[PDB]
Amino acid sequence: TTPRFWSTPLKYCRWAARERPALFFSVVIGALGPVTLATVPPLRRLIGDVDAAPIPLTYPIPPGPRKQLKGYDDDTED
C-alpha cells in the first residue's frame, strides 16, 4: 500500500506529505535552511544588499608608527 521511495521517489513524497505530514515537512523545513544558505547570499549581493561591517568589540588600535603630537602638554595646565 505505502510507496517505496527508491521504487518511485515522487509517489513517496506525495504519500509522506498526506499521511506523515509532521515528519515529512520537518525534513522540508530543515532542508530549507541549507537551501537558504546556498541561494540567498548570492541573490542578496546581486541586488546590492551589502553585509554590514562588524561593530567594534575592542578599542580599535590604529596601525603604523605614532604620530608625534604636540599639544595639551604640562605647561598648558594653567
Add this chain to the structure above:
Amino acid sequence: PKDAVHLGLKGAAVVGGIGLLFAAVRTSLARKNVGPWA
C-alpha cells in the same frame, strides 16, 4: 651509627599501619555484623 630501636618503631608503625588498613577492610567485608570495635 644509627638508632636501631628508634628505627624499629618507625618500621613497625609504617608496615603495621598498612595492617590496620587490611584489618579494617576485612572487618567491612564480614557478613555477620560484629560491631565497629571488632
Add this chain to the structure above:
Amino acid sequence: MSYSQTINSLVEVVLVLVPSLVGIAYVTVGERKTMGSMQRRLGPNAVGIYGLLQAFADALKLLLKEYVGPTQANLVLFFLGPVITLIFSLLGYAVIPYGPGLAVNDLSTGILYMLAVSSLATYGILLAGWSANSKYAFLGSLRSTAQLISYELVLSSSILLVIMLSGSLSLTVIVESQRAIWYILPLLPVFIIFFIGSVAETNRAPFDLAEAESELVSGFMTEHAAVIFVFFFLAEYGSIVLMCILTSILFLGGYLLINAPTVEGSFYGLSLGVKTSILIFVFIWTRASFPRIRFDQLMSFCWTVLLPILFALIVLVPCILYSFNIFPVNISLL
C-alpha cells in the same frame, strides 16, 4: 540612592506579590464565570456582589478545614511536596518586567531562571503524589512525570528560537527587541507550539492527566486536603498566569503599547495585563472546547509531531538570520 535599600526592596516585592496574589484569586473566579457563559450559565454571583468574594470564601474555608495525615503516607514528604510546588511556582514572578527593568530581579539569565523554577515545582507534584501511598495519587504522580518528559523539551526548544532573535536571555531585552515587530509575526508556528506546550506545562485541559477526575478521582492530590490542597491550586493558577505572562513577553511584545512616571508605568502594566488577560481567556476557552487526550497520545504528540518541527526550525531560523545579515548583537544595548 535616595532612601533605604531594604525599604525599597520591601515595597518592590509587595507591589508584585500582593497584586499577583489578588490576580490568582480572580482567574479562578473568571474561569468559573467564563466557562459558565459558554455553558449558558452564570458562574459565581452570590458570594460577594457579582460573586467577587468567591475565591476568598474558598480560600478561607480550606485554611479552616481539617487536614488529614494518611497512615500509609510518608508524612514529611506529604507536606514537603506542596510547599515546594507553591514556593517555586511563585518564584517565577521575580523576573517579570512590568516595564523596562521594572522587575524584582532584572537578571541577564531570566529565561533559564524561569525554566529552573518551573521544573522544581513539578517535582513537588511527583513527590506529593508518591508520598500518599494511595493508588490514585500514585497513578497521577506517574502521569506528571510523563507530562514533563513531554513538555520540557518543547518549551525549552521553543524558547531557544526566541533567543536566536533577541540574543539576550534577559526578559526586558526580548520585549525591547519586539519594538521592531512582535515575535508572534515571524515566529507564528513557534507561538502556537509554545502555547500548546504551556497548556501541557500547566496540567490544564486538554492535557489534565495528573489531576484527571474522569479517570483518576483527583489524581496526585486525592489524599491531600485543607491548606495542602490550597497550595496545589495556588501553584496551578499562578503557574497559568505566569505562563500567559511569559507567552506575552516572548511573542506579544510584553508591556509594549498596542506623577509623570506613574502614567507611563500604569500604561505599561495595563498593556501587559491586557495581553495576559487575553491569553488567560484562551486557556479557559481551550478547557471548555476540547476533550481530554490520553497520556500516551500526548507523549506521542510532543515527541513525533512537535519536537521534529522544532528541531527543523532550529536548523532553519539561524540559516535565514545569517542569510539576511540579521544576527543580533549579543552586547548590552536594549
Add this chain to the structure above:
Amino acid sequence: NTPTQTYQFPSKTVKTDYPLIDNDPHFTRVIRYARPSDYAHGLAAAAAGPAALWLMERISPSQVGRGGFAKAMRLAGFIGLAGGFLYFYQRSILRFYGMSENAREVEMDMREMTDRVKAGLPLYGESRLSPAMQGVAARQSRYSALFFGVMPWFNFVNHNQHGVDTAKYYQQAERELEAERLAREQA
C-alpha cells in the same frame, strides 16, 4: 607594493620531501590542482566498496530477503563514494603539503600567485569572516587532510595564514614587472 612583512603568524615546520606550497589550501585550489590520475584513483577507490560487497555476495550469499542487498548496495555505494572523494582530495593536498611530488603544483602556484600580486589582488582572497575567526579557521584546518581517515575537514575560508613566506611571490612579480617595462620601451 611590498607588504614589508611576509611571515606574520607562527607556523609548524613538518619534515617532508618536497616544497610546502600551502599548509591550508582552499577547497577550490585542491580540486583545480588535482592531476587526472587523482580522478582515476578516486573513481577506482569509490567503485571498490560496492564491488567488494558484490563479490562477497557472489562467493558467500548472505541469504537476505528480497530487498536487502539493494539497500546494502546503497550504503556501500555511498560509503565507497564518500571514501573515494576523501582519497581523491588527499592526493591533491599532499602535493600542496610537500608530502608528494609537486613540481607541477609548485609552478602553477608560483604563476597563479604572482598573477594575483601583479594584479594587486590579495594572495588568498578576501574573507567575509573577521580576522580572528580567520585565524581560528586556519588553526582548525591546517594539515587536516592527515586526519581524513578519522574526522574530515575542508578549508572554505579565504584566510591569509598558510605557513609559507609570501616574499618569493612579490619578488617574482616585481622582476616580471621589471622585464615588462623594459620590453614595453621598445615600442
Add this chain to the structure above:
Amino acid sequence: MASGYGLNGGPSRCFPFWQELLACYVTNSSEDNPDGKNKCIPVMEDYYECLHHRKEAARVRALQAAYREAEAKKLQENPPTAGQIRNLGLLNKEEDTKKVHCA
C-alpha cells in the same frame, strides 16, 4: 590562565605571563643547549604567582601585621567619621575633604 579566554569575553589575566614563558622556552631552549631553559625558571615562577598568589599573600600578610601594630602604637587624636570619608570629593563639602587629609 593559559587559555587566553576569560570570563567577560576579554582575555584571561594570566595569559601574558603564560605567553612570556612559552616565548622564553622556544627562544632559549634547543637540543644544542639543553640548559638554556633555566632562563625560564623566573618566568615560570611568575606564571604560577599570577595563578595562585602565594608570594603576594605572604607579602601582604607580613606587611599587614607590621602595619597594624604600628597603628596601635601610633598617637591618636581624632578619628574621621564614616560620613566624613563619604564627603571627600563632593561639590560643596570642602570642609570635610580637608579634615580627611589633615590639612
Add this chain to the structure above:
Amino acid sequence: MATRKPAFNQHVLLDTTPLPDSIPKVKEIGASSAPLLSASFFIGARCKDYNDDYMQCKNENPGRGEFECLKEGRRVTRCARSVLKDINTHCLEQFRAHWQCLDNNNQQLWQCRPAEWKLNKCVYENLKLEKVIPDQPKNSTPVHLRQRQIFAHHAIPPWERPFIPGQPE
C-alpha cells in the same frame, strides 16, 4: 586592584597618599556619565589623535604602560577638558538639554535624538566639530541621522529634522 567583579564586597579601601611631586599634576575631568556620553563624539572629533596616541603608547610598553605613559594620559585629560569648556562657553543650553534627556532615558542615544540634533548643530557652528561614526552602511541613511527611531519609546516629532552639516534648511 583586580579587574574581577566582586561578589561579596562590603568595604571600600581609600588611599589619601598623593602622587609624588615628580609626576606633573593634571586636574581630573569633572563631568558625569550623562554629560560625557553627550560630548563623546566631540571628544573624538578633537582628541582622536591623543586618544589614539595614549593607547599605542600602552601597547608599546606591554605590562608596564600604566607607569610609562603618564604624560600621554595627562595630554588626553587636557584635550578632553578643552572640549568640555568649549561646549560650556557656547551651546550650554543645548548641551544640558541633551544629557539631562539622556539620564531619564537609560543613556540611550536613540531616545534623545531631537536634543542631539539641536546640540550637534550648535556645536558645529561654533566648534567645527562633527559627529562621525566609521563603517556605517552606505546602502542606508546613518541611524543617528534617521527621522524615525524604531526602538525609541516616543516617536520623533515630524517637525524635528536631523542635523546634516552643509546643506541649508
Add this chain to the structure above:
Amino acid sequence: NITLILFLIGILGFVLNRKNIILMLISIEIMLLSITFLILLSSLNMDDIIGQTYAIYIIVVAGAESAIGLGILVAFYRLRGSIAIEYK
C-alpha cells in the same frame, strides 16, 4: 574544601554501598559533581572560561553515563528481577 568532602561521600557511597545499584549510579554522580565543582571554583580564581566549558562537557557525559547505566540496569533487572546488592 567542600569539593573534597563531597568526593569522599561519593567514593564511599559507591564502595560501601549495601543497598541497590541505583545508589551506586548516584554516587558516581556525586563524585562528578565534586570534580566539576572544583574545576568551577578554580576557573573563577584564574579568570578561565575554559574550565566552565570543561565543567559543561563533564555534565553532558555525566548524563550520558547515567542513561547507559539506567539502560543497563533495566536489562539486568528484566532477567535478575532484583537490583539490590546482597550480603549473606
Add this chain to the structure above:
Amino acid sequence: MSAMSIYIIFVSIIAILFLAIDLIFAPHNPYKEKLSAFECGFHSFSQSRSPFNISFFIYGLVFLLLDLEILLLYPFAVSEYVNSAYGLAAALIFIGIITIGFVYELGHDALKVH
C-alpha cells in the same frame, strides 16, 4: 537588602502563614478510618511501594540526552554576532549528528507505546 532575597523571604512566610493557620485554627480529629487510604470505598492490597511497570521509561532515557543537547545550543543563541558563518557551521554539524539519533528513535519506533 536585595529584592530577590526579600522575595524569597515573603513567599516562604506566606507558605508558613497559611500552613500555621490551618495547623492552629482547624479542627483535628484523626481516627482509624479517617486516616485510611482512599480506594473508592473498599480497602484493597497496598501495592504502591512495590515495583511498578512504567511503559514510557525509554522516553525518560531519551529526554535526559536531548535535554543535554538543547543546553549545548543556548550559548550559540546568545553568541550569534561573534560566531557568524564559521560558528554557525559547527552548530549545524552538532544539530545534524543529534538529529540522526532522533531519526533512530523515530524509525525504531522506540516512542510508540501500544
Add this chain to the structure above:
Amino acid sequence: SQISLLLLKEIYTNGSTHIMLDILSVLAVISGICVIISKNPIVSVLHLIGLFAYVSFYLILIGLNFVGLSYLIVYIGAVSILFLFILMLINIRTSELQSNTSNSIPLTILVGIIISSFLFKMLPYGVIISNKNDLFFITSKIWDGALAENNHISSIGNIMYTNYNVWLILASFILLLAMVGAIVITIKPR
C-alpha cells in the same frame, strides 16, 4: 599624624554576605551524607536533588549564574527520571527493611583520613583560601576591558563552536552512542 588607609562600609552596590556560602557548604555536605545513609530510596533521591540545589545556589552566588542555573535545569530532570526508575526497579518496602551494618566505620575513618590528607595538597592556594590577621581581596575597575562586557554564557559561546569545536563533535558522538545504545538494550522486540 596621618592614617592614609581608610576602611569604610559600602552603603549601596555592596555584594552578598559570604556567611551564606558556609551555610550552603554545611547543607550540601549534610544532604550529601543523607543520600547514602537513608533507608528509603525516594528520601535519598530527594536529598540528591537538594544536594544539587545547594551547589547550584553556591555557584549562582559567586557569579556563576549560567552553569549554576544550567546545573539545576539538567539535574532536576535527571533526578526526576532517576526517581522514575526507583519506582520501576526497586521494592521500596523491602529496601526500607534492608539495613546497614556498622562494620564500615573503621574503614570509613581510615579511608577518609588518608585520601583527604593526601588529596589536600593536590588543591591550589586559590581554593584553600578562607579555610587574628586575615587577608582581604581588593578589586578595582578597568575601561578598556569593560567596553562590551559579555555574560559568561556568551563568553563560552564565543569559543564553544569555533576554537573548541572538537569537544562539541566528540560530545555529540558520546550522546549519539547513548541515544542508540540505551534504546538498543531496552527496546521491546517488534
